[PDB]
Subunit: 489 residues, 4 copies
C-alpha cells in the first residue's frame, strides 16, 4: 500500500495559459478548504471573463493552421498522451493526496480508483490518435467522395467537485487525441489536482496554448466559457440545472457543440434468483461509494418480494459495519460529505422518509455534532411516491423498494426523467437480457456495479445527459465531419 | 418529359394523427398561396399546442415496448421504407406539382431534383434498417461488454419552405429506419407535400402513430414541439435565428437531442488554372438554383485576378440567357420568389449593392410590375465589407469578388461565423486538396456544385449547424448508445 | 399454403453466357434424376473447360473499365439486386418445385426455408451496394491517405446438392453488390434452380456477362474454374476433401482468393438447467432437418447426467412421430436421401453403432427395401471414441452422449478438427456466456438451432472453412483493398 | 547521428522456445555471413521438424484457455507491446548493426528506416489491443445476436532476407495485439535480429511460449510450419514461387488461414506535367533503395515522351553520384548485394539488357573484382518485351521506358500478373485520381515513393499476395469471427 502524505504543500495555485503561470487579472484569490478538518488548505488565483479571454486566445493561436500542435503527425499526439500518462503514474501519490485534501475521499480510493481511471483513460485515448478514420464513399463512376474527421477547435471543459481530476481527464484525453485545444475550469471547491495536472502537461511537452486552466466560480468563469464566441465545443459534468444553463448559453451565443454528463435516479433491480450475497454487496457499494456522492449512485434498490426481507436484513448488517472516519487512515471506507448545503440536504431527506411511512432500519442521523459525517442509512417499505425514491439524495441513504413482476419493475424503473445507469442481479439468461434491453439507461450493469472501462462509453439517456464519454464514441464529440466531393472531368 | 399538372386539386389539407385526418382543435385554418399566380390554393387546418399534444401522445403510444412498430424485425422496417419510396415514385408527378404550386420552383426541377432526392434518400435508409450495428468491446477475461444502438423515441421534425418535402424526408428516412416515431411540422408557407406524404405513409402500411403531421405556425406548433417534455429528439432545418430558439427551448425543457441545419455564407473559389467554362456554369447554377433560395447558394464568388474579367463576362451571358417565367413551362429555369417579404428583401439588397460601389453587370430589378419574379442579377467589383457580400441574399444575385493568393482567399472564405458548403475550381491536385483541408465548411465541392448523395453526409461547421444529415452519420442522430456490461461469476 | 406443382416442365437446361443460352461446345449432355421417384427429370447441357473459358472471357469483358456494369452508380447495383429478389419472389413456387424435384426435400421446406433465405439474402446485400466504404487515414500534415474497397473481378462460385439455390445466392448477392462478375457451377446432381435463376438475372436487367452459369461435373467444370488463370476469386461450399483440392488448385495457378464453407462435427450441449422440451425439440430439428443432409446438423448431442435419461426418452418419442414420405405432400417433414452412396454410408455407420456398444433406442434401418428413405434413428450410451461420434453421418441419426461438468464438455466439444456450429441449452446466464466464449465454432446458438439471418455471418473455425458468408463480413471476401497515398508539395 | 558499431559481438544464436535458449535437436548449426567483408559472422542453431514440433507445442500450451496469456485483459497486451517497443528503441543501435551485418544495408538506413518502422508498428498495434471490436446485430425482437473477434490461435511467420526484423514485426505486432501465440522462422541468410528480438520479448514480460523462434532452412523448418496440423494461421513474405508452395501446403494439411506478401513488377509513371525533379528523386530512391532489393522497387519507370530525354539525363546524374561502399560509413547509400547468387543474377540481367537493344546510360558492371557491389545502372530505350522490363531484377538497375498516352500506360502498367505497388507523378488532379483508380495495385503512391505508415494497409492484387499487413485491416488476418445468436424464450 502507498504511504499517505498527510502534510503535503500545494505548489500550483495560479492560472495556466501558454504553459506559464499567471496571477488573475483582477488580483483576486479564493480559498479551498479541507472538508475533513474544515481548515483552509491554500489560496488559488480567481479567474474571471478577462482571464478566460486570454486562455481562449491562447487556445485559438495553438489551434491555427501551421501551428506546432496542428503540424504534429497523428502518432506524435498519441506519444504526448502516453508521456502524460507516465507522469501521472510517476506523481500518482501526490495527485491522490491533493484529491483527498480537496474532496475528503479516502487516500487509497483516490490512489486506486480516481488515479487508476485517469491513467487508463489517457493510455486508451493515446491509442486512438492515429486511428481516427473517416470514410471513402461510393457514389458515381466519375466522383471521388470522402469524409475527414477533423478536430472541432477550442474545447471548454467544466467539471464538478466529486471526481475532479477523473472528470477532467475524461474530456482532455479524447479532446487532445483528436487534435483540439482546451480551456479547463475545475470546480471552485476542488481546483488543486487540475492545476497540478497543468504542470505535467508542460513537462510532457505539449505546445503552449494546447491546454489552458482557469480556476474560479461557475457564474463568472463557467458562464464566460459557455457564452464565449470563440469556444467551439463544451463538455460539462455536474448538476442537471447547471447543465441546462450551460447548453442554453452555448445555443444563445455561437451554437457551440455541448456534451453533458448529469445526475441520475439510478435503479438497482434484484431478482429472486440472484446471488443474494453478490447483490447485497454490489447494491451496498452502489449506494455508499464516495459517501453516496456519485452520479452512478443507486437511488432506488428494487428487490423481488421472495427475497425482500432477507435482502434488507443483510443490507442492514453491511451498512452498520462500514468504517467512517479519517480519509488518510488505511481502514476508512467513508470520509466526510463535501460541504454544509450537501450535508443538510441529506438529513432533510432522511427526515422525510420517517414522516412519509418508510421504515428506518439503521442510521438516520449525523455521526457527530461537529463534522460533516453521516451514518450509513437504510430504509425499507419504500414506495415510488416517496421523496426518498424521487429525489437524488447524493448521500449514504439506501431506499429499498419491493416488486412482484419483471414487467412491473421495468415500468417503475423507467418512470423517471433520468437514465444514467441501471444494475440487474439475476442468474437467469432471459431475465438479464430482457431487462438490459428494456431499461432506459446509458449503462446497464448485470451482476456487478460501477464497472467502468476506458473502452466502454458512459453517458445518459433522457435528462441524464447528451453524448457519451469513454470508448470510440467519445471521438464523435471531439471531431467535426467534413465531406469532400470531387467530380472528375 | 413528364406532363405538367397545371390544375391539380388539393386532396389533403388536415392534421394527420394515428393514420387519420383531423380538424384543428380550434377549428381554425390558414391559407396557402401560389407565388406564381398569387392566388390562394386552399385552406389547411391550423394546428396549435393541443394538436401537438395529441400527435405526441399518438407517437409515444406507437413507440411503447410491445407495440406493433417496436416488435417488427429490422428487415421489416426496411421493407416499409422501400414501399413508401415506391409510392413516392408512383405519385412523383402529383408531388412535384404540389411542390411547384407551394414554392414556385419549376415543375421539372421539383420532379428530377426534389423528388429524385426523396426517393433516393428513402431507399438508402431503407437499406440501413438491418445494418445499425453496435459493438462488442474487449475488457477483462470475466466480462462481456457490448453496446446497443437503440432508437431515441419520439422525434420532432421542423422544416423550411425552400425544399419542403426533401428536408422532411432527410429526417423521416433515418428516423424510421432506426425505429423512432415522429411528429412533423412543415413550414406554414409550404404544407401541401407533407400532408400528401401522410396519405402515402398510411398506404405503405406504417402502424398508426409512427408518423404524425401538424401543420401550423412556428411560435405556436414549432415552439410546442421544441419545448415538449415527451419529444426526445428534434431535427430542424431553417434560419440560424430560429435554430437558436429551438435549441434553447430543447435545453430548457427536457434536454432533448437537437440536430440543426442552418444558413451559410458559402464561398465559391475559382482559381486561374480552373476549367473556366466549368466554373462559370457551376457558380451560375450554384447562385441561381431554386431562385437563389438555397442553403447551399454561393454568397461570394471569389475569382482569381488572372481570370476575373473573363469570368465576369461569361457569367453575365448565363444570367441574361436564364429563362424566367411560369414554373409549369418546360423552358422555365427560374420561377417567382416565395413571397412579397422575400422579394422586397432581395430588391433592398440589390439597391444597397449599387449604393456601396459594386458594378451592376446585368439585371438589378423586377421582371415586371405585378409579379414576384426578379431579373437574374450579377455584380462585379464586390468587396468583403459590402452588404451583398456579407448578408444572405436568398435570391438570384451573384456577387463576384476578386482575389490574388490562396492564403488570402482561405482567410477571407473562413472569416465568417458560418460553414455549410464551399466549392473550389482548379485543375491542380495540391491546390484542390490544400483548399479542401483548409476551408472550414461541412461540404467542400471540387470542380462541381450542389453534388449531393444520400450516402454522403451534409451539415455545417460553426453557426451553420450541429450534427449531420444523410450517410451513415445520420444514424448517430437517431439512436441512443447503451452499454451493457456483464460480469461472469 | 402454396399449391404444389407435381408435374412441372423444366424450361432452362442450357449453358448461360452473356445472357444467352448455349449448347455445350462438345454437344454432350447429362441427366438429373428425381430422388423421390428415381426417374429422369430431363437432360442438361454438359459444360467442360472450353465452356468455362467462354464464360470467363464473357465475365472479364463485363468487368473491364468502361463497361456498362462498371459504370453503374453504386445505388443502381442495389436496385438490380432488389429487382432480382422481386422476380425470385414472383416465381417462388416454380423455384421451390424445381428444388424439390432435384433434391427430394419437401416442397413447403423449399418454399418457406430455401426460397425465403434466397429472398432475404438478396434484399440484405442490395442494401450494402452504396454502403461499401473504405477509410481516410490520418498520417502526416502534408499527406492524404485513404483506402478504396474495390471489386476483385471475376468470381467463381461452386455449390453443393443439399441447398442448391441458397448456397449460390449466398455467393452471388455479396459478389454482385460489390461490383464483381461471376461464373457459377451448380452441383451436377442439382443444376435446375441455378439455370432458372439465370433467366431471372437477364429479366432483372443485369448487363450480359455479369453472371454466367456452366453446369457440369466437379473434376471437369469445377477443376477448370479452380485452376483458371483469369478467375480472381472462388467461393466454394461442399465437402472438406473437395474444398482442399479447390484451394490447392487456386494456389498452384494464380493465387486466386478462396472462401470455403465445409462440413462440421457440430455439438449440441444440453445442461441440467435447460428448458428440456425446448432442448429436445431443437436437437431433434438439428439432427433430422433436411434428412440430416445439412452442414449445420447436430452430430454429437451432449446431455448432462441429471437429465440424460429423460432427454433420451423424449427424443425417442419425437423421432418415432416424424412423418417420412412424399416431399410434395403437405404433412411430410422428411423426404428421401439424395443418392445411393450417401444412403449406404448412413446404414454402414448405423451398423457400426450397435457393434461398438451404443444402445439403439429406435430406427436403425431403411424405411422400405426399394426407396432411399431411412427411419429416424437415436443412439444412447454414445462415447467419444465411437464412429457415430467421430464421423459426419449426413443422415437421420442422433448420437446422445453423457457429460458431468462444463469444463469436461468444453474439452470434448472442441476435441475435433472442425468448428462450424455449436448449440447450448441452459437457462443460466453465466453458463450460456462461458460456453459461447469457450466453444471453437463459427456460430454458437443459445436456446435455439438453425437460427440464420442474412445480417449474421456464418462460417467455420479450423477445417470447417475459411472466410465468412452473410453479414457485413461477406463484403471483405468480395473486395480488394487499395491504399492511395498522396504527398502534397 | 548514432555511432556505428563496426565490431559488434553476436550474443543470441540459439532456438527460442518457452523464453529459453535451446540447441537444435540434431546439434547441427549453419553459418551466417557478412556480405560486405564476405566473412562468417557466427554459427546459428539449425532447426528442423522436431524443433518446430517443440515450438508449436509451447505456443499451443501458451494459448490454451486459462493460460496467463489468455487471461490478461485487453489493455495489458497493449502495455506488453509498448514495453517491447521501448526495448527495441533502447537497443536500436545494436539491432541496426546486426541488420547491417546480415544484409549489407547501410547502418543509417537500418537505424532510421527499418528500426523506425519496427518501433512505429509495435506502438500502433499496441493501441489496437483494447479496440478490437465485434458487432451487435439487429435481427428479431426476441433475439440477441453479436460477433466476437477471437484470436485465431498459433500463428506461423515466415520472413525474407531483405527487411528481416521489419517483416517479422509486421506479423508479430498485430498477432500479439489480437491475443495469438507464435512460431517465427527468419530467413536462413538473416537470423540475427530475430534472435535478438527473442531476448527482448522475454525481457518485456511476455509469458513463456507466446513467441517462439526457430532458425533454419525453408524446405526443413519452413515446410514443417506450413504443413503443421496445430498451426492455425501462417503469414509469409517472400517469393511468389515459395508463397504458392506455402499456401498449397496449408490447404493440404489443416486449411490454416494464409496471408502472403509476394513480389511485384511495380510501375512508376511520370507524366509530362509532373514536378520533374521530384519524380527523378523519387523514381531513383524507388529503384535503388536497399540495393534494389525491395518488393516495392520500381521495375518499369514509364516516362511521358515530352519529358523522357530530360528525365533520363537527370536520372543518370543521380545514379553516377550515388555513394556505394562500406555500409557502416555515414556517406554510404548503397551497400553490397546479399550474396553471390543474387550478384550474378543481376549481372546476367544487365548483360541481357545490352544484348536486347537498351541504351546503357551508366554503370553496367561490378564496382570491383572481389566484392558484391554493383555500380548503379540506368537503361534507356527499354521496351515491354525485354528481360530487364519483364523480370524482377532485385538490384540497382533502373529501366526507363517511354509512353505517349494515359490509356496506353494504364494498359501496359496493368499487363502483369502482379500488383503490389504503383507510383504516379503529375500535378493534374483528374489525371492523378484517374490513375489511382485504374492501376491494379495494392498501394498507389502519388508524388511520392515508399511512403509507408503503420496505419495504412499494404499488400498485393493478383499474384503479389493475399490479405493485408498494417492498418486496421491487419486485425482481420489475426482474428476469427464468431457469431453468438441467443433466442429469448
Ligand atoms: N452558471 C454556470 N455556468 C457555468 N458553469 C457553472 C455555472 N454554475 C456552476 N458552474 C460550474 O459547473 C461545475 C459543476 O457545478 P454544479 O452543477 O455541480 O454545482 P454544485 O454546487 O456542485 O451543485 P448543487 O448546487 O446541486 O449542490 C463547476 O465547475 C461549477 O463551478
Ligand atoms: N475436383 C473438383 N474440383 C472442383 N469442384 C469439384 C470437384 N469435385 C467436386 N466438385 C464440385 O464441388 C461441389 C460440391 O461437391 P462435393 O464436395 O459436395 O461432393 P459430393 O459428391 O457431394 O460429396 P461426397 O463425395 O462426400 O459424398 C459440386 O459442385 C461438385 O461438382
Amino acid at each position: 500500500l502507498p504511504r499517505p502524505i498527510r502534510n503535503l504543500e500545494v505548489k500550483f495555485t495560479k492560472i495556466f495559459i501558454n504553459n506559464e503561470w499567471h496571477e488573475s487579472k483582477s488580483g483576486k484569490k479564493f480559498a479551498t478548504c479541507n472538508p475533513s478538518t474544515r481548515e483552509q488548505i491554500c489560496e488559488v488565483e480567481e479567474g474571471d471573463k478577462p482571464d478566460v479571454d486570454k486562455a481562449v486566445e491562447a487556445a485559438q493561436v495553438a489551434f491555427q493552421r501551421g501551428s506546432p500542435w496542428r503540424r504534429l503527425d497523428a502518432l506524435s499526439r498519441g506519444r504526448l498522451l502516453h508521456q502524460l500518462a507516465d507522469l501521472v503514474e510517476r506523481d500518482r501519490a501526490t495527485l491522490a493526496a491533493l484529491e483527498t485534501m480537496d474532496t475528503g475521499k479516502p487516500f487509497l480510493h483516490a490512489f486506486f480508483i480516481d488515479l487508476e481511471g485517469c491513467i487508463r483513460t489517457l493510455r486508451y485515448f493515446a491509442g486512438w490518435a492515429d486511428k481516427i478514420q473517416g470514410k471513402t464513399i461510393p457514389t458515381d463512376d466519375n466522383v471521388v467522395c470522402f469524409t475527414r474527421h477533423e478536430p472541432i477547435g477550442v474545447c471548454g471543459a467544466i467539471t464538478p467537485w466529486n471526481f475532479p481530476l477523473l472528470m477532467l481527464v475524461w474530456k482532455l484525453a479524447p479532446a487532445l487525441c483528436c487534435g483540439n485545444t482546451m480551456v479547463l475550469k475545475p470546480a471552485e471547491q476542488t481546483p488543486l489536482t487540475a492545476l497540478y495536472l497543468g504542470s505535467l502537461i508542460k513537462e510532457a511537452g505539449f505546445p503552449p496554448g494546447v491546454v489552458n486552466i482557469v480556476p474560479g466560480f461557475g457564474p463568472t468563469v463557467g458562464a464566460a466559457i459557455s457564452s464565449h464566441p470563440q469556444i467551439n465545443k463544451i463538455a460539462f459534468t455536474g448538476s442537471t440545472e447547471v447543465g441546462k444553463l450551460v447548453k442554453e448559453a452555448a445555443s444563445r451565443s455561437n451554437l457551440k457543440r455541448v456534451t453533458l454528463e448529469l445526475g441520475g435516479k439510478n435503479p438497482c433491480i434484484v431478482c429472486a434468483d440472484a446471488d443474494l450475497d453478490l447483490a447485497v454487496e454490489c447494491a451496498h457499494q452502489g449506494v455508499f461509494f464516495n459517501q453516496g456522492q456519485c452520479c452512478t449512485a443507486a437511488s432506488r434498490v428494487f428487490v423481488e418480494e421472495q427475497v425482500y426481507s432477507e435482502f434488507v436484513r443483510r443490507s442492514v448488517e453491511y451498512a452498520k459495519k462500514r468504517p467512517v472516519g479519517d480519509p488518510f487512515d488505511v481502514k476508512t471506507e467513508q470520509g466526510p460529505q463535501i460541504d454544509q448545503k450537501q450535508f443538510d440536504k441529506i438529513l432533510e431527506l432522511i427526515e422525510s422518509g420517517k414522516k412519509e411511512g418508510a421504515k428506518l432500519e439503521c442510521g438516520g442521523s449525523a455521526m457527530e455534532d461537529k463534522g460533516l459525517f453521516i451514518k450509513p442509512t437504510v430504509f425499507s417499505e419504500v414506495t415510488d411516491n416517496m421523496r426518498i425514491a424521487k429525489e437524488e439524495i447524493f448521500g449514504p441513504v439506501q431506499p429499498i423498494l419491493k416488486f412482484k413482476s419483471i414487467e412491473e419493475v421495468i415500468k417503475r424503473a423507467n418512470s423517471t426523467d433520468y437514465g444514467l445507469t441501471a444494475a440487474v442481479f439475476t442468474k437467469n439468461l432471459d431475465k438479464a437480457l430482457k431487462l438490459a434491453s428494456a431499461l432506459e439507461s446509458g449503462t446497464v450493469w448485470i451482476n456487478c456495479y460501477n464497472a467502468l472501462y476506458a473502452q466502454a462509453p458512459f453517458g445518459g439517456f433522457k435528462m441524464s445527459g447528451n453524448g457519451r464519454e469513454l470508448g470510440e464514441y467519445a471521438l464523435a464529440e471531439y471531431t467535426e465531419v467534413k465531406t469532400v466531393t470531387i467530380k472528375l472531368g
